Amino acid sequence: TAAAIRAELAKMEPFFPSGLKIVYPYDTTPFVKISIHEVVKTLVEAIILVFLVMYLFLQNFRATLIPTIAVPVVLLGTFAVLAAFGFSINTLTMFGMVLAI
Amino acid sequence: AYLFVRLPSSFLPDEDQGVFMTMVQLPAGATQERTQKVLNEVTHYYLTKEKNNVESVFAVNGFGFAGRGQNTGIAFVSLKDWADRPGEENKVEAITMRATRAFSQIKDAMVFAFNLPAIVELGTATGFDFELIDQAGLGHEKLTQARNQLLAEAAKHPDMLTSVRPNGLEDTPQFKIDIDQEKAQALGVSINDINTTLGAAWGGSYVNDFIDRGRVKKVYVMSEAKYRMLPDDIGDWYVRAADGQMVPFSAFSSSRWEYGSPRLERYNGLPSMEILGQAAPGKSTGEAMELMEQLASKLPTGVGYDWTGMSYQERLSGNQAPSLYAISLIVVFLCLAALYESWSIPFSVMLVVPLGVIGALLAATFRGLTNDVYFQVGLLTTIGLSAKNAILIVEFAKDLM
Amino acid sequence: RAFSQIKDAMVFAFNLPAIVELGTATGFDFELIDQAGLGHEKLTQARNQL
Amino acid sequence: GVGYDWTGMSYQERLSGNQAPSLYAISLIVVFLCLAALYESWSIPFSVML
Amino acid sequence: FVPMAFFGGSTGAIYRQFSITIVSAMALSVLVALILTPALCATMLK
Amino acid sequence: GTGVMGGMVTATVLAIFFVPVFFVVVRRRFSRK
Amino acid sequence: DRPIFAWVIAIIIMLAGGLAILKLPVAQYPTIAPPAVTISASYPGADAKTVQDTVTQVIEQNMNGIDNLMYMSSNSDSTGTVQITLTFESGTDADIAQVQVQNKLQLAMPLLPQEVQQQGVSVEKSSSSFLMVVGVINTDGTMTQEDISDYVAANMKDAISRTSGVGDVQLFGSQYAMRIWMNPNELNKFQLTPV
Amino acid sequence: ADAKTVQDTVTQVIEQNMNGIDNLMYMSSNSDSTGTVQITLTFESGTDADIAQVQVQNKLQLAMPLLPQEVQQQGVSVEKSSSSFLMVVGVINTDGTMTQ
Amino acid sequence: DVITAIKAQNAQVAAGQLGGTPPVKGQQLNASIIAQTRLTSTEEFGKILL
């Protein structure tokens, strides 16, 4: 929005005269940039924790690859069927994606 | 079931934002001079004894929520990163705590510093927002008394507690110039000429538009502040008559101090004052709203009651937690017989579920916390994923039968 | 040819671009803006300079 | 205080460019696939895709 | 899952912020771990 | 996820053998009919 | 069932799945608003009692036949301003609940004093929260409050309010006006009046 | 009115009120010496020709009385554009010539 | 003359404020000024002078 409130602001920076440094006293953007970076975390080290705990129990790279090749497909597929028909496409669905992970 | 009723619910939890804001408000018709004294006393705190947490203070004087005025003002706060403030003592959780303490500890005017409720608005958790309406068509003064009478009996209940306060309360003395219509008409002055004088010289007038170095801008005529600071300045304003000379005020006008409201509010075309309150440290909403329902019913005629906050409308956990698992249950119970058949399986699993729901209330209680809408999703995955542990041993076995 | 060959005023005779408008093939449409708030006369000169 | 802007023309965002390489990129990923649906392996994906 | 899609009004669709998706997971997991997985088992294994 | 991991240990230790699971194809299928 | 397919189904649902992650940036929330449509009028200089009787009550009188609607609140202020927020049902139509409210005002428009008209009147969508506050401060030949807030409006604000889905831009200050500060004594001396 | 007046008195007043119109790409103006001006708000390919219509009209509905009462009653209208014609239908006389 | 005298007496006017927007540094009180107000009854309308 929001990526475009900055857009106009970006093009009017050069025509500015003496001493016009635009600051950011209050911005919401930071956290939505983080509410993705902190759930990629609880997804990557979920995957790392997935092909571990398999070396315990079943053992072997050649057998731990199978239950881990399935996890990208289900996750990638889930944020595809958000748009589908006439519904979602959001975060919190990406935050709550982790609880479904 | 005991670990359940004792454990309170949770909406969407008050989560820190990396940014928060304060709330400044002044008494009976304070000046822009007096409120800046308070805003400077606030901008000071964040910049002096909180250098390691506060990035920026964007103090705005004359703003304030619930409406603008020369009596409000609020300041926005940017916080120093996220990693730059490690502990709980270092973030919004308790940053506001000493802020609320230090501001309210000693001050001539009230100051808060709330936390952003992690959304746009509406429905905190246990909150309420009452509204009292002029129904029969009584006076505003006759209404405000019933508002005070309700605030008198509500606060009279620290037993089954509540915390109730109104909005932009005031009713500040406003100066009324009483123009004598027949005294003015006698000495040659036009009524559509005195009111223009009194209006433009004290309030200001939008005359026309003018071009300023590229674009169209406004032309306001108001008059110097030197001659509009105090009631005595009304006199030294001169108005021209039909004779061709100047008749001043007071010779045709009357000067009186009188009470009036700076903020009149109306709910649904009817004059209605708003009251904001609480639940109690013990009970919540269901009773906090219920006792408030008839505190207004036990007072002056033509008063009524209404809610907007808050009071949903139609949602929450109640009505969206029993009928939820009713239509979940009818589904749950079914297809526990899809390839399993009969009422043989519908008890081998449909009530294996209260194993997961055990803690849960242990984790939710013995870890502080409270039952929220991720508990109301986790409590709901500890049902279905527990089935691949339950319906995948009744099927994993009984296929031996 | 015949119109533009000899005339006191300019005359063209274009062909309808097979649609409503926008994007011929290799065409462009530049626009020069008063940004700092200069005069129209001060602008028209930069238009001429370009 | 002069700046620049385009409207014609300058699309906005279309043409052959940006709508001819990424077009056959998502065409290629499809093309290359199911040249193994009932054909299997990377045996067929070169017997036809080129 | 799903049925919470007949929800309330101002807790908008927070239970449809997913009674589905954990179904867009489950049914897709049911199908992705149905079409694929048996095919992933008997290839490189043992 | 606290309601999950907790809702787990109470259904990964108290389910695996404890109460229901096992009283399921036995106690709940017949014992009566 | 055999091999070389399935993996291709896994090639889809990941490419077609990853085509829907091309929704980057993508929002934070889930919009959970019973939509708010606000009308703002401003009688300059007039008291709170006048602006209730002269504009507030006149607007509320014309609020009949707006589709859906939940309630209607008002705030006739002493600053000479009032906002009327019509709240609709969660997920009505922010674009259709907008135009009706505007076209109920379009029959209450000339019943308002011509002092209050030309002085604005506008209908927009509400949120009560900000995405960005962008402070333009001076770090050289200090322009000053009045000088800056004018420039930020005469160079920046116009491009914002008329761009990517902005509800309303509450700028911090005001743009310049040709202010005529009258003197009643240098006004009495020449038998003149503010009129 | 001249081209300079119609820029300052109507054109700039309308453009000033163009805040909060959904989507929108750009905004062009043509303050003419004939005493006329058109403001064309261009939207994204396949927005809604019926919803992008009413907002533009209801931004003008707060710039309406800021325009001189000489310019009001003398029209003001908001419609959808194409810049091309389907039909030109000439009504000509072939008897007692009526005249232009 | 009935009409002209009606709106002359039955009028609601917006006057300025004591200690307005641009103040004198040291202003203590801020209050709104009420001049004329709308007549509310049949008796007050009867007293409208012509």
XYZ file of C-alpha atoms in Angstrom, chain B residues 188-386:
199
model
C -28.953 52.171 12.294
C -27.032 48.849 12.205
C -27.938 45.763 10.141
C -28.171 42.326 11.804
C -26.473 40.665 8.807
C -23.618 43.099 9.522
C -22.997 42.669 13.275
C -22.971 38.854 12.981
C -20.463 39.075 10.113
C -18.316 41.338 12.321
C -18.586 39.040 15.368
C -18.147 35.958 13.154
C -15.191 36.932 10.951
C -13.292 38.840 13.660
C -13.366 35.943 16.148
C -13.839 32.748 14.114
C -12.396 33.669 10.713
C -13.860 33.732 7.202
C -13.251 31.817 3.976
C -13.522 34.730 1.530
C -12.157 33.456 -1.804
C -9.225 31.574 -3.371
C -5.842 32.814 -4.642
C -2.945 31.347 -6.653
C 0.312 30.902 -4.720
C 3.448 30.212 -6.819
C 1.746 27.474 -8.889
C -1.433 26.330 -7.107
C -4.761 27.601 -5.728
C -4.840 28.285 -1.969
C -7.165 29.900 0.595
C -7.681 33.496 1.777
C -8.615 33.716 5.471
C -9.527 36.935 7.283
C -9.577 36.602 11.084
C -7.842 39.533 12.894
C -4.841 39.806 15.250
C -4.812 37.740 18.462
C -4.171 40.937 20.471
C -7.880 41.830 20.231
C -9.549 38.425 20.712
C -7.954 36.991 23.881
C -10.481 38.121 26.516
C -14.210 39.171 26.844
C -13.182 42.842 27.272
C -11.883 42.895 23.675
C -15.488 42.421 22.454
C -16.164 46.051 23.446
C -13.382 47.694 21.412
C -14.876 46.341 18.161
C -16.694 49.029 16.159
C -19.598 48.565 13.711
C -20.791 51.192 11.196
C -24.362 52.532 11.178
C -26.585 54.110 8.492
C -25.586 57.594 9.720
C -21.972 56.861 8.668
C -20.305 56.459 12.073
C -19.118 53.740 14.464
C -21.300 52.154 17.142
C -19.313 49.721 19.331
C -20.508 46.591 21.162
C -21.952 46.556 24.734
C -24.151 49.492 23.633
C -26.333 46.915 21.843
C -24.922 43.626 23.204
C -24.932 41.753 26.527
C -22.018 39.794 28.007
C -22.755 36.598 29.969
C -20.779 33.549 31.116
C -22.751 30.317 30.624
C -22.192 26.540 30.719
C -22.225 24.567 27.457
C -20.891 21.317 25.998
C -17.690 21.297 23.884
C -18.531 17.836 22.504
C -22.170 16.864 21.896
C -22.713 13.300 20.677
C -25.692 11.522 19.089
C -26.444 7.821 18.569
C -28.797 7.077 15.639
C -30.342 10.543 15.196
C -31.047 10.879 18.930
C -28.915 12.819 21.475
C -26.793 10.207 23.254
C -23.777 10.336 25.588
C -21.267 7.460 25.624
C -19.891 5.644 28.692
C -16.868 3.307 28.544
C -16.363 0.646 31.230
C -14.898 -2.667 32.416
C -15.731 -6.253 33.423
C -14.281 -6.843 36.925
C -11.189 -8.721 38.178
C -13.555 -11.662 38.819
C -16.498 -11.719 36.398
C -16.416 -10.780 32.696
C -18.850 -9.202 30.184
C -21.780 -11.644 30.670
C -22.420 -10.134 34.110
C -20.472 -6.860 33.704
C -22.899 -5.907 30.934
C -25.947 -7.488 32.630
C -25.803 -5.385 35.816
C -25.184 -2.302 33.647
C -28.350 -3.103 31.645
C -30.705 -2.214 34.519
C -28.655 0.532 36.192
C -30.110 2.631 33.355
C -33.500 0.894 33.652
C -33.739 2.014 37.300
C -33.503 5.757 36.545
C -35.433 8.726 34.893
C -37.973 8.166 32.082
C -36.940 8.286 28.402
C -33.380 7.005 28.757
C -32.909 3.531 27.170
C -29.740 1.495 26.551
C -27.516 0.469 23.616
C -24.097 -1.071 22.896
C -21.603 -0.801 19.981
C -18.005 -1.584 21.103
C -18.088 -4.437 21.926
C -21.448 -6.225 22.004
C -19.858 -7.730 18.903
C -22.318 -7.689 17.110
C -22.968 -11.463 17.443
C -19.560 -13.265 17.699
C -16.878 -14.003 20.401
C -16.237 -17.437 21.930
C -19.827 -17.785 23.198
C -22.228 -18.824 20.394
C -19.036 -19.602 18.431
C -17.703 -22.541 20.501
C -20.697 -24.738 21.446
C -22.530 -24.744 18.074
C -19.073 -24.977 16.467
C -18.351 -28.366 18.077
C -21.998 -29.361 17.629
C -21.613 -29.337 13.837
C -18.040 -30.582 14.377
C -19.414 -33.440 16.512
C -22.076 -34.571 13.999
C -19.238 -34.735 11.465
C -16.693 -36.227 13.966
C -19.128 -39.018 14.986
C -19.913 -39.773 11.325
C -17.278 -41.395 9.006
C -15.926 -42.932 12.168
C -18.036 -45.545 10.361
C -17.124 -44.827 6.701
C -14.986 -47.960 6.296
C -15.202 -48.802 10.017
C -19.008 -49.362 10.260
C -21.635 -49.299 13.070
C -21.474 -47.547 16.465
C -18.421 -49.734 17.201
C -15.793 -47.118 16.315
C -17.663 -43.834 17.252
C -16.583 -44.373 20.892
C -13.179 -45.922 20.257
C -12.093 -42.431 19.072
C -14.768 -39.692 19.421
C -14.017 -39.735 23.161
C -10.311 -40.511 22.953
C -10.169 -36.755 22.274
C -10.245 -35.660 25.956
C -6.683 -37.000 26.266
C -5.292 -34.098 24.216
C -7.629 -31.566 25.840
C -5.939 -32.372 29.202
C -3.048 -29.890 29.043
C -3.871 -27.927 26.976
C -5.370 -26.536 30.235
C -2.171 -27.622 32.030
C -0.021 -25.849 29.423
C -2.454 -22.907 29.296
C -2.588 -22.517 33.107
C 0.770 -23.779 34.471
C 2.534 -21.642 31.841
C 0.556 -18.492 32.717
C -1.245 -17.747 29.425
C -4.964 -18.133 28.536
C -7.218 -20.014 26.054
C -7.043 -18.085 22.757
C -7.923 -18.549 19.053
C -4.771 -20.641 18.506
C -5.663 -22.756 21.492
C -9.037 -22.760 19.684
C -7.055 -24.237 16.755
C -4.477 -26.290 18.700
C -7.236 -27.715 20.916
C -8.687 -28.521 17.479
C -5.580 -30.175 15.977
C -5.027 -32.184 19.194
C -8.337 -33.749 18.114
C -7.619 -34.651 14.479
C -3.915 -35.493 14.729
C -4.766 -37.564 17.829
